[PDB]
Design a binder for this molecule. Sequence first.
Ligand SMILES: *[C@@H]1O[C@H](CO[C@@H]2O[C@@H](C)[C@@H](O)[C@@H](O)[C@@H]2O)[C@@H](O[C@@H]2O[C@H](CO)[C@@H](O)[C@H](O)[C@H]2NC(C)=O)[C@H](O)[C@H]1NC(C)=O
Length: 198
Amino acid sequence: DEITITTQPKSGYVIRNKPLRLQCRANHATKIRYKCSSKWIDDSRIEKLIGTDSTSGVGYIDASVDISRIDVDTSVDAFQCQCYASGDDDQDVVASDVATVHLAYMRKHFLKSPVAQRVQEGTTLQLPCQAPESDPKAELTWYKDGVVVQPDANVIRASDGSLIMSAARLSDSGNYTCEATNVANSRKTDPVEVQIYH
Ligand SMILES: *[C@@H]1O[C@H](CO[C@@H]2O[C@@H](C)[C@@H](O)[C@@H](O)[C@@H]2O)[C@@H](O[C@@H]2O[C@H](CO)[C@@H](O)[C@H](O)[C@H]2NC(C)=O)[C@H](O)[C@H]1NC(C)=O
């Protein structure tokens, strides 16, 4: 018969340095070859499972491959892959559904870090924090003396990630750390101290 794709490679992310496994199975097929961003992947990296169904008696080939960060760097950060089922010369090559591969990362250093400040009581306090270049956008959480800053009437979380106190209270004196948690990594800022005087 003709070659049909049993299972399609699924789109996903490359978290950290954890690869993204792409699986692809075809019936009546002898070989499976992947192609990412117009560049064939070495068959040394492909794990091929070849057999025959004990009931149907049809030949199948199940192939997987780990897409690492190195493949993304060598090649738009989002690229496309798809397998190709091969066989006898008369057999026509059938391509599969193309799966796009995204990269999840987080850089080394924050873009805007908080600095220690001595602020007069009743003055509007602002402690900036901009996460490192991350994709997806990392979540910002503030800590004060080891406890998480819970926004209240005085403290408000701004859209730019900066922590803003409308009226600086003496209690607001603490060591503040900004944490940027991402799917790829989690980093914290250098602890800075702020003190309020009257
Ligand atoms: C901001 O922090 C400093 C330092 O705190 C200590 O060291 C940190 C790394 C962490 O381990 C904290 O839990 C420690 O307490 C504070 O200065 C210290 O204050 C403690 C009393 O709370 C005192 O025993 C130490 O001698 C002080 N100095 C040092 C070098 O530790 C400072 O008070 C904090 N500021 C605010 C507003 O909370």
